[PDB]
Amino acid sequence: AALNAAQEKEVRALVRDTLVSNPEILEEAIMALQTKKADEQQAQFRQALASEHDALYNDAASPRIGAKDAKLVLVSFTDYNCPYCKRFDPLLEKITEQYPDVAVIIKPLPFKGESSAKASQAVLSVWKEDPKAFLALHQRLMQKKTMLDNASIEDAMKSTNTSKIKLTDDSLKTLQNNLELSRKLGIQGTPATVIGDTILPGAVDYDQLEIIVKEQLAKVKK
Amino acid sequence: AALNAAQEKEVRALVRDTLVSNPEILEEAIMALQTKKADEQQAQFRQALASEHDALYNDAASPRIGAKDAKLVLVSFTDYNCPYCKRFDPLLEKITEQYPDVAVIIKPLPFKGESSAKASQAVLSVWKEDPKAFLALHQRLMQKKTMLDNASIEDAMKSTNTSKIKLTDDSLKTLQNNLELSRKLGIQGTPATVIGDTILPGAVDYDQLEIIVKEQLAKVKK
Amino acid sequence: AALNAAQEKEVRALVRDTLVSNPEILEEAIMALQTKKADEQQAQFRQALASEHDALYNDAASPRIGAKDAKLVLVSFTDYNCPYCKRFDPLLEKITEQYPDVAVIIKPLPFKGESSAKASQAVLSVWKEDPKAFLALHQRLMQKKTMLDNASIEDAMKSTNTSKIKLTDDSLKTLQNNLELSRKLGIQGTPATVIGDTILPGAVDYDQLEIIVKEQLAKV
């Protein structure tokens, strides 16, 4: 609404024209990227959670398994082709409303491949249009053994009534927010679950996960 | 325009600032492309052959060896640094005169290095301004034993009377189209030749190639 | 007054949006850079000195150690993580102190890593806001044994009163200019020093460097 369609499309042509005509802009943006990675990589961890509370716990684009109004919320960084995530996600859903004032926030990651980014792109695109339709797709993207492809996924989005949903480019923005966050939180292992100022890197026994979520509910008010 | 030079002047400045101030935009586009590569890589070669018919056969930026109006048209994805292409390219030119109803469209590829991109950038730039000078340059770049540099390329140019010719950035657009089409068609080797309804991957003995294309001249008779 | 603030942000959204919806714009721009890089590597060394004299000697963004009034100007491509530059940089302040008609322009390079690029970005940012404080930071980053970190750089700024200065993105253009310039000049070792029409690559004994710069003070 700031720019008109005629203005808006000329700008889109200029982006292409400028980067190719002046490639020096690109290498500058490359070194600037490799630098910002280091700025986040060599940061202080706890103060990341105090400064990243709004992106972790208050992202409207981040899928949630459980109640939207809960006192304790877990954040699970996951990959749909990672065997350990497939082994832990069920443990994360069972704690949801066996312990009802606890919910789980999903942060999909593109670590193990292109399908990981692709599967994430599907899951995030679904979350905005029909949030309740997320779960069925989420479980089968997880419970499907082997590295999914666009073909394996076209079967998955179809066993969940989510095939009319288009993978948006804006859903890719969120996947990135999750990716920068893993670095800011210093996570290069998945699964990773944030449960209140602390991170859980790896698969943990249910009865231990059980104790942890209870200890963090003691950490809250009355 | 739509935009005035001053506005146009700011847009070129903002793209630099945007990419440098927010470098994460870049890595987002990096995986988005690795994603897009795979979507083209995992495309169906038939519906790739069917949907890329105008891109293969009706690109004015793609050089043609043979008759302008021919019914059988071969599309050769080539690289000027490929040892096999140098020995296969003459064989494709022999068919264009033994069989006047056959033409060959050159689809240069930048697989084997940066010089390949530069050499491709040259022939495509020449073809757009003066098509008649292309073949001489094409052959001198191709039939050149050993790797290419800007000097070896520049030696082949006025030695074909063509260094007055500018290497345009729009020729990169065509090289790029050649690059994406190669992925949609499932091409993991140069040379690669489109021969009707299937692709011929590799350097082939002439008499093997001969039977193949007359077999393709039988399917259009007239 | 070309674009309004609302327009300036939509343009920022469109550049972001356009590159992601059409990632192919990027890949075309990737090999335009890889091509441009090779074009610089395959330049003739001397005609690179002749064609970018304006970039070497007349960049207001390039720090200078010595007199604004000098007849001879040295251009030293250096790295704050290169041990040879740490042994050569002190020798460069002596000639500017031995010979007041000689000056030194610093051309930082991010060759040995990301730490090199950040450290350069810190030093260049100071030069733009507080030129007088540059030398102190420059010297303290140099005499630092071992590689630098985000902490090590920031500590050297606190030890020189330059921590209040922000690392600008405008310094990356300069950092980038030095990198393309290093390629055109065919520099694959630091230190590298432009001394009129020749480059002297490496840490050299003072008495060798002295004879050279006096000999070129004879040619001017």
Author numbering:
A (entry chain F), B (entry chain A): 3 to 224
C (entry chain B): 3 to 222
The authors write:
Although it is annotated DsbA-like, PmScsC is a powerful protein disulfide isomerase that is able to refold and reactivate the scrambled disulfide form of the model substrate RNase A just as rapidly as the archetypal disulfide isomerase E. coli DsbC. Unexpectedly, evidence from chemical cross-linking, small angle X-ray solution scattering and multi-angle light scattering all indicated that PmScsC is trimeric. The N-terminal residues bring three catalytic domains together into a trimer, and a unique flexible linker enables extraordinary twisting and extending motions that impact on the catalytic domain placement. The combination, extent and diversity of these motions would enable mis-folded substrates bound to PmScsC to explore a broad folding landscape, consistent with the redox foldase activity of this key P. mirabilis copper resistance protein.
The three crystal structures—which we refer to as compact, transitional and extended —reveal an extraordinary range of motion in this protein. Importantly, the compact and transitional structures have multiple protomers in the asymmetric unit that adopt the same overall structures in each case (8 compact trimers, RMSD ∼1.5 Å for 645 Cα; two transitional trimers, RMSD 0.5 Å for 653 Cα) so that crystal symmetry does not appear to impact on the observed conformation. Moreover, the compact and transitional conformations were determined from crystals grown under similar conditions (2.85 M sodium malonate pH 5.8, 20 °C with either 0.1 M cobalt or copper added). Nevertheless, comparison of the eight compact and the two transitional trimers in these two crystal structures, reveals an unprecedented level of conformational re-arrangement (RMSDs>20 Å). In the 24 protomers present in the compact PmScsC crystal structure, the linker forms a loop that positions the three catalytic domains close to the trimerization stalk. The eight compact PmScsC trimers are mushroom-shaped with dimensions 80 × 80 × 50 Å3. The two compact protomer conformations of the transitional structure are similar to those in the compact crystal structure (RMSD 0.9–1.8 Å for 188 Cα).
